[PDB]
Amino acid sequence: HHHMLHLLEQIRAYCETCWEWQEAHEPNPMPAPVEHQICPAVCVLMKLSFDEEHRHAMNELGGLQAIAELLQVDCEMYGLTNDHYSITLRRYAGMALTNLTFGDVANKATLCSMKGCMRALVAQLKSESEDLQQVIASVLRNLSWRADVNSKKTLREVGSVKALMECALEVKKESTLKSVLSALWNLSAHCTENKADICAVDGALAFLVGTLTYRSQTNTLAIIESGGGILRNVSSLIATNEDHRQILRENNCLQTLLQHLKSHSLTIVSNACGTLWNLSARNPKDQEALWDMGAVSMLKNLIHSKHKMIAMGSAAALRNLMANRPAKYKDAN
Amino acid sequence: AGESLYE
């Protein structure tokens, strides 16, 4: 913990020189992190941060604040027209911020209060380094989990929703998509504005429907779970917009949500019930489509679930269908 | 989705 003390000192000193140089310009050469051996200092701290005891130690020294200050000043100074040394420093800083925000109420609140830093994080979602995108999305995921009211407000105001959703459309790797969709699933639960901002991004809804049938090479359900959780969270709005329901229908959303009802993942089943609850309301064509696919018996099979949202959503969707039995069914016509 | 350590 002397070692940690020393590395944090190096970081704070470097930040202080950067802030002097910035403040020289208000009413010496520009500091370069390579000239202060910053990348190895944050690398070490990043490695230490995986251990719970080392994290407690870091927190007594304000490690989160100092590493956030570093990230923020480097982004301000060099933006996205930076070099590899700088991309590297931001990655290892971002990993550390992920580890330090995990489960940590104070650390989340502090970081979300740093508005400059929050803006810097969101800007990195467009980094040439997709791995850096993954790292930044991991931070945002943590910050969006159990966010207090000020932190929710900040996450929204810095444009994290639209940025993440745009990000998702361009990523090539599963790991990046997992972190991006997890952050978006958390964000989608905060407020209706966030739900609207997802639905507004051109191509998002189709993309999200696409994730419901993702073929993970790593024998996991993480992508289906997060993509379906976003969808279930935005379905209340989708239900109001015929254009949006149409996008869903013509990417085979409905037959997929019915197949989800049989999952071993309670998360997948719950997400599907919640989305069906909303999409089964009002629209006779979607009601009839669902009747024709045997939704009624499928939903009846879940109404006794121990899982409160599964039981609630299945029964609600079922009442929607049962109240609107299509004319062709009424023994005919 | 929940929170987590860097992966």
UniProtKB/Swiss-Prot annotation, chain A:
Forms homooligomers. Found in a complex consisting of ARHGEF4, APC and CTNNB1. Found in a complex composed of MACF1, APC, AXIN1, CTNNB1 and GSK3B. The complex composed, at least, of APC, CTNNB1 and GSK3B interacts with JPT1; the interaction requires the inactive form of GSK3B (phosphorylated at 'Ser-9'). Interacts with APC2. Interacts with DLG1 (via PDZ domains) and DLG3 (via PDZ domains). Interacts with alpha- and beta-catenins. Interacts with AXIN1 (via RGS domain). Interacts with ARHGEF4 (via N-terminus). It comes from Homo sapiens. This is Adenomatous polyposis coli protein. Belongs to the adenomatous polyposis coli (APC) family. Expressed in a variety of tissues: brain, small intestine, colon, thymus, skeletal muscle, heart, prostate, lung, spleen, ovary, testis kidney, placenta, blood and liver. Isoform 1A: Very strongly expressed in brain but has relatively low expression levels in other tissues. Isoform 1B: Predominant form in all tissues except for brain, including gastric mucosa and blood. Tumor suppressor. Promotes rapid degradation of CTNNB1 and participates in Wnt signaling as a negative regulator. APC activity is correlated with its phosphorylation state. Activates the GEF activity of SPATA13 and ARHGEF4. Plays a role in hepatocyte growth factor (HGF)-induced cell migration. Required for MMP9 up-regulation via the JNK signaling pathway in colorectal tumor cells. Associates with both microtubules and actin filaments, components of the cytoskeleton. Plays a role in mediating the organization of F-actin into ordered bundles. The gene is APC. APC mutations have led to some interesting observations. (1) the great majority of the mutations found to date would result in truncation of the APC product. (2) almost all the mutations have occurred within the first half of the coding sequence, and somatic mutations in colorectal tumors are further clustered in a particular region, called MCR (mutation cluster region). (3) most identified point mutations in the APC gene are transitions from cytosine to other nucleotides. (4) the location of germline mutations tends to correlate with the number of colorectal polyps in FAP1 patients. Changing residue 12 to C: In FAP1; benign. Phosphorylated; phosphorylation enhances the F-actin bundling activity. Phosphorylated by GSK3B. Ubiquitinated, leading to its degradation by the proteasome. Ubiquitination is facilitated by Axin. Deubiquitinated by ZRANB1/TRABID. It is found in: Cell junction, Adherens junction; Cytoplasm, Cytoskeleton; Cell projection, Lamellipodium; Cell projection, Ruffle membrane. Changing residue 108 to E: Impairs interaction with KHDRBS1. The microtubule tip localization signal (MtLS) motif; mediates interaction with MAPRE1 and targeting to the growing microtubule plus ends. The basic region (residues 2167-2674) mediates the association with both microtubule and actin proteins and promotes the bundling of F-actin. Signal peptide: none annotated. Changing residue 141 to E: Impairs interaction with KHDRBS1. It is linked to Familial adenomatous polyposis 1: An autosomal dominant cancer predisposition syndrome characterized by adenomatous polyps of the colon and rectum, but also of upper gastrointestinal tract (ampullary, duodenal and gastric adenomas). This is a viciously premalignant disease with one or more polyps progressing through dysplasia to malignancy in untreated gene carriers with a median age at diagnosis of 40 years. Desmoid disease, hereditary: An autosomal dominant disease characterized by multifocal fibromatosis of the abdominal wall and mesentery. Desmoid tumors can also affect paraspinal muscles, breast, occiput, arms, and lower ribs. ARM repeats lie at residues 45-87, 97-139, 140-183, 184-230, 231-275, 276-317.
